[PDB]
Amino acid sequence: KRMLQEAVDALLDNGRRGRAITGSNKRPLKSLADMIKGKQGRFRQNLLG
Amino acid sequence: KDLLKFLKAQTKTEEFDAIKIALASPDMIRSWSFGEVKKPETINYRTFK
Amino acid sequence: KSDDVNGRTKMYKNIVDGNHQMEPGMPESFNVLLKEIRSLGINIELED
Amino acid sequence: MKQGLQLRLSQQLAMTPQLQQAIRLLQLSTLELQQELQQALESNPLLELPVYQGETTQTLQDYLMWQVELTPFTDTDRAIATSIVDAVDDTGYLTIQIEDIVDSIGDDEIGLEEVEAVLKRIQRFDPVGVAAKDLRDCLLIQLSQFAKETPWLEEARLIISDHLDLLANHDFRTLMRVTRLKEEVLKEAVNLIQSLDPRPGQSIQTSEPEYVIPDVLVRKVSGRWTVELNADSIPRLKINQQYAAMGNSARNDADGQFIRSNLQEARWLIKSLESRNDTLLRVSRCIVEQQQAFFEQGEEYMKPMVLADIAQAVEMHESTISRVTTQKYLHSPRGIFELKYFFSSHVNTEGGGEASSTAIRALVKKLIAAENPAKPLSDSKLTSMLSEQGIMVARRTVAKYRESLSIPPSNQRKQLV
DNA sequence: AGGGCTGATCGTGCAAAAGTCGTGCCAGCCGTCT
DNA sequence: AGACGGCTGGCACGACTTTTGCAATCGCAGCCCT
């Protein structure tokens, strides 16, 4: 259950808690909040990008 | 179906004024979706279906 | 000229017929935003 | 040392057939075996953006829909046209009949004449191949698009009108007698029909993603190379050593017993994986014992292969080898083939030899390549050629190989020069 | 005080009925030549 | 213009494959029934 709660947290926000990386890449993943926030979120490129 | 109003009903939108935001509850969460996912499989390479 | 799928065809027809009339409808990216917001524990909808 | 039914020695072995052992064999389920292993490892305690262009034409179906919508059509007319466009196959022929379309309309005012008029307006659509009928109708549309200066256009039209059966059976005598066809005029008409763009919708669907699985490798660099059968893709999963130590350190005796049972299951899984790897290696060695000979000799020079003989050479259980052969693929420098395709059918051959059915089929295909284009080689001629090759295969065997090779009928494949 | 008896742990096969293929062979038919 | 021929394909019979449907009895001994 602790694994499951951690996984759900990472799915929501990986940058806040935990570090998930892809195969052969150490970069973090783009969680459901990552594509909302930052320069590469939905709100960006929404302002007529 | 008379096949004449079915197509026109597809191209329709409401006023959509006064957008509102709130918290989520499991019952209505169940309401939006139609299906329950139990398996982690995404696609089969045997038939690509 | 935006993601309005039901508007690009109609503007093209209005041009080729020389109508030059536009109906806004709704951008699809707004629906994208709504769908991704509803992916988390937050309700969001548009009233009348 | 030839006495019979003497004192019986005590048996020092058992069959010990376990459903666990059979599942361990998994009939070499490969990716399916990987999925089953994943499911078990999940059930076993203490075990273990992109570019996204998203841009493509909808096989011109979207283009056709836009063009029909681009043309001025009434709301009911637009709906009828959209329904007709929906009844379009990839080849470009209508799947449903006009009566089926009228029934789907479900309007008493809707009639056969109006539906036909709508289809005819739809028939002259934006791209080629919008006939939604037989290619002969599509051929007529192309000829209408083609210049009238083309020779034998009237003759081709007359043949396609009601002499299509004569053309299908390649009955040149009766067709010429009925249509007063001139000598070599049929050749010109056939050449024109060659440039008719049959199955035009196929060319529109230019996109075709490739699908292939690595499975076994037959690279065989410098001969007899141990090309691993996707060793990278092999799971080789192991149980959690830390959790096992926790189970070993469990205070509760029942918890320790449960951990011991889990460890026994993990050992069973490890034995299964090791057995799978060993079977794969042994099968690779057995294949390499003769695979290079078959590869160098060629497909037509393929010796028969017996599953029992291969198992005897490997000295393993014959049923085990048969199960391993199932659902197994072996990519090779020549190409990717199934393990059954890797095995060879048994057929008698002359001079004290055994010839594969695939070998005979490839020889027959090579012979068919060396044939007169005007007149296809007869099955009797194929049997004569096989007798020349000395493969001890008669007319029936030649016909079976041709069916394997999908050889066309002699009369059907026959054509003018 | 004496009998019943209960579950831990107990590891690469095979065969037998079924199926399926190799091979041959006959029956008709159409293209044909007489 | 009816028969020659070759094809094709169904029909049959042996010969090779192959798949699934198959696991007790322990030797401990304490607990429960008699």
UniProtKB/TrEMBL annotation, chain D:
Q: What is the annotated role of this protein in its UniProt record? A: Sigma factors are initiation factors that promote the attachment of RNA polymerase to specific initiation sites and are then released.
Organism domain of life: Bacteria
Which Pfam families does the protein's record reference?
Answer: Sigma54_AID, Sigma54_CBD, Sigma54_DBD
Which keywords does the record carry? DNA-binding, DNA-directed RNA polymerase, Nucleotidyltransferase, Sigma factor, Transcription, Transcription regulation, Transferase
Gene3D superfamilies noted in UniProt: Homeodomain-like (1.10.10.60), RNA polymerase sigma-54 factor, core-binding domain (1.10.10.1330)
Q: Which InterPro entries match?
A: RNA_pol_sigma_54, RNA_pol_sigma_54_core-bd, RNA_pol_sigma_54_DNA-bd, RpoN_core-bd_sf
- Provide the GO MF annotations for this entry: DNA-binding transcription activator activity; nucleotidyltransferase activity; sigma factor activity; transcription cis-regulatory region binding
Which GO cellular component terms, listed alphabetically, does the Swiss-Prot or TrEMBL entry include?
Answer: DNA-directed RNA polymerase complex; protein-DNA complex
* PROSITE patterns attached to this UniProt entry: SIGMA54_1, SIGMA54_2, SIGMA54_3
Outline the extent of the RNA polymerase sigma factor 54 core-binding domain: 56-243
- Tell me the ranges covered by the RNA polymerase sigma factor 54 DNA-binding domain, including all copies: 257-415
Q: Native species of this protein?
A: Klebsiella pneumoniae
Keyword Transport recorded = no
Similarity annotation:
Belongs to the sigma-54 factor family.
Q: Which GO terms describe its biological process?
A: DNA-templated transcription initiation
Stated name of the protein: RNA polymerase sigma-54 factor
